[PDB]
Write a protein that binds this DNA or RNA. Structure first.
Ligand SMILES: [Mg+2]
Ligand SMILES: [Mg+2]
Ligand SMILES: [Mg+2]
Ligand SMILES: [Mg+2]
Ligand SMILES: [Mg+2]
Ligand SMILES: [Mg+2]
Ligand SMILES: [Zn+2]
Ligand SMILES: [Zn+2]
Ligand SMILES: [Zn+2]
Lengths: 295, 241
RNA sequence: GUGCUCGCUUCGGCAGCACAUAUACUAAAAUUGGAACGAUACAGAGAAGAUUAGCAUGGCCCCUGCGCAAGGAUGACACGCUCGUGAAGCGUU
């Protein structure tokens, strides 16, 4: 009769670079027990700020325990290291973690993980980060590098949609047309985005990543000789030999500047496959980028 | 039929959870819930049920026994090894855990390195059946110097006249007559030297009668001079032979 | 915006100086999910004859109450564990 979820009261929120904005001087507001968590339904310390000039006054949505558990932002619900949905990262690494959906089991599991984290060092996304050591499979290809500030854009003025926004240019909300309501990208359940179940953004990025054969190769009839284009005279056979020395023993390494192709062949099929996958539009040696294909 | 089976499983799980919540300390509800989950081929659900029951009361022998038997009845051998390691490290004085761990790692496991694991039990000074089973296990693995060290530690840890007689019989059966004579001499020098047990002297006289009848007659005369009716019977047997 | 210039110099203004320096859960909304328990219907008041006073005990069951009080049908809910068959280990033959 004396078990309940403890209230998470802590400073220093864990946010992305994009949602934090671009100004080095940010004015910041904190409520001690302002709102509830959007997932585990516990009260938590709510942080609110304006990321920039014409932004939305973004505020934290989920509690710090859930965000430390899934290694995501407290507002964007995207991964801190890569800026991806957690469904995409779970498809990349491991999807056997899961979480309960019924509220009593969810509160019990969250209390157990909170006690485990509080008995730990304090800032560690459990052993899942231990399963996150293997990386750069395909997630680095579609990961953003620039801060996408267009998701800090303000909301659409509903009075302007009906054509009755009497504020005009004084209205801070957007006086532009919204997205298509018939589009299935516009559903976006928050619990579905947190749990990584049927998120349409994750499905669209998985379909986009599946159409980019950056690790396919294998266009030769059991021949290890593959041609990497884009090398030219800038990349010589020494860089190809240094790249193939990690795979073991190389059968042949050569570079031809007449066709600007590096011919790489290995005595092992697995080493030649790894050398073709590493050089398929992802290898840069001596200032020259190589794309692997049949030769 | 799938929806009816799901409703039946939901009703059975609701009644099992209500029986758990009504009386938490009654472990038979936990055992029945875990066996019903194992009968529906849900290994991880029954493992979670058993882990919850061990969190409720870890001192029960039957919870560990049933959860290790459920791990061993399936193909989860390493899970059963982890379960037995936890059961040994929490409850070392329960010999049934040791016996079933050694039968699991000896018959099904067939690993000789489990004998090194068995040496962990030899840190705990168990009852004499553990020493006898380890003697017979080292004989089944065809080791006699190791079994000599085992029986020497058995004599040092649990000294008894029957233990010294078993050491003499094991040294005689392993074709080490000089070691058997030295063990009989050490047993005469230490075990009942002033207590006058008059039973290790009879075994030494029997070993000498197997070896040389003059030393057997001398041992029978020394036993008759040191002393019962059995010593007089042994002296009459030595005089008749 | 106010006030003043060893101003430019018209008498209007420019220029400079000084003061004044960061509101908003930013909506007059669009949305979204939860529901009093009233109508009907299901429904039917503990203790081995009947009519019944009750106090508890347990917790992912609550309500009225300012309650460490008292009520809510005792607030409701909360029963079935002495011989053989095999297997393993131990000692004798
Ligand atoms: Mg009655
Ligand atoms: Mg009363
Ligand atoms: Mg009462
Ligand atoms: Mg009453
Ligand atoms: Mg009454
Ligand atoms: Mg009552
Ligand atoms: Zn963010
Ligand atoms: Zn939370
Ligand atoms: Zn507007």
């Amino acid at each position: 009769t004396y078990n309940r979820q403890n209230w998470e009261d802590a400073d220093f929120p864990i946010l992305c670079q994009t949602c934090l904005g671009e100004n080095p001087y940010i004015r910041m507001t904190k409520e001690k027990y302002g709102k509830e968590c959007k997932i585990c339904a516990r009260p938590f310390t709510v942080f609110r700020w304006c990321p920039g000039v014409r932004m939305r006054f973004k505020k934290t949505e989920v509690c710090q325990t859930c965000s430390k558990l899934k290694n995501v932002c407290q507002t964007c619900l995207l991964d801190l290291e890569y800026g991806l949905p957690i469904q995409v990262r779970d498809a990349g690494l491991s999807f056997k973690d899961d979480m309960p959906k019924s509220d009593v089991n969810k509160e019990y599991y969250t209390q157990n993980m909170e006690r485990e984290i509080s008995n730990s060092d304090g800032t560690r996304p459990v052993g899942m980060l231990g399963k996150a050591t293997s990386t750069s499979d395909m997630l680095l290809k579609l990961a953003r590098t620039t801060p996408y500030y267009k998701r800090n854009r303000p909301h659409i003025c509903s009075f302007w949609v009906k054509g009755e926004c009497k504020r005009g240019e004084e209205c801070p909300y957007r006086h532009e047309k919204p997205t298509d309501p018939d589009d299935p990208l516009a559903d976006q359940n928050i619990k579905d985005r947190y749990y990584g179940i049927n998120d349409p953004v994750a499905d669209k990025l998985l379909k986009r990543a599946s159409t980019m054969p950056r690790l396919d190769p294998p266009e030769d009839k059991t021949i290890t000789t593959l041609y990497v284009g884009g090398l030219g005279d800038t990349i010589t056979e020494t860089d190809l030999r240094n790249h193939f020395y990690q795979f073991g023993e190389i059968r042949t390494i050569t570079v031809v500047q007449r066709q600007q192709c590096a011919f790489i062949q290995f005595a092992t099929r697995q080493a030649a496959e790894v050398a073709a996958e590493k050089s398929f539009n992802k290898l840069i040696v001596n200032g020259r980028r190589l794309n692997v294909k049949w030769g | 039929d799938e929806e009816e089976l799901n409703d039946y499983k939901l009703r059975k799980r609701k009644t099992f959870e209500d029986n758990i919540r009504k009386n938490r300390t009654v472990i038979s509800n936990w055992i029945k819930y875990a066996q019903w989950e194992e009968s529906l081929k849900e290994i991880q659900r029954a493992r979670s049920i058993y882990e919850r029951a061990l969190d409720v009361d870890y001192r029960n022998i039957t919870l560990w026994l049933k959860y290790a038997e459920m791990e061993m009845k399936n193909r989860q051998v390493n899970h059963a090894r982890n379960i037995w390691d936890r059961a040994i490290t929490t409850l070392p004085r329960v010999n049934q855990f040791w016996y079933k761990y050694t039968y699991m790692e000896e018959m099904l496991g067939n690993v000789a390195g489990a004998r090194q694991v068995f040496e962990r039990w030899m840190e705990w000074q168990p009852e004499e059946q553990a020493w006898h089973s380890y003697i017979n296990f080292e004989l089944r693995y065809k080791e006699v110097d190791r079994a000599r060290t085992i029986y020497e530690r058995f004599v040092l840890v649990h000294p008894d006249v029957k233990n010294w007689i078993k050491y003499a019989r094991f040294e005689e059966k392993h074709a080490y007559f000089a070691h058997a004579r030295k063990v009989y001499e050490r047993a005469v020098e230490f075990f009942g030297d002033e207590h006058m047990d008059e039973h290790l002297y009879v075994a030494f006289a029997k070993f000498e009668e197997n070896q040389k009848e003059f030393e057997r007659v001398r041992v029978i005369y020394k036993y008759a001079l040191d002393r019962a009716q059995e010593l007089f019977k042994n002296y009459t047997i030595f005089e008749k032979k």
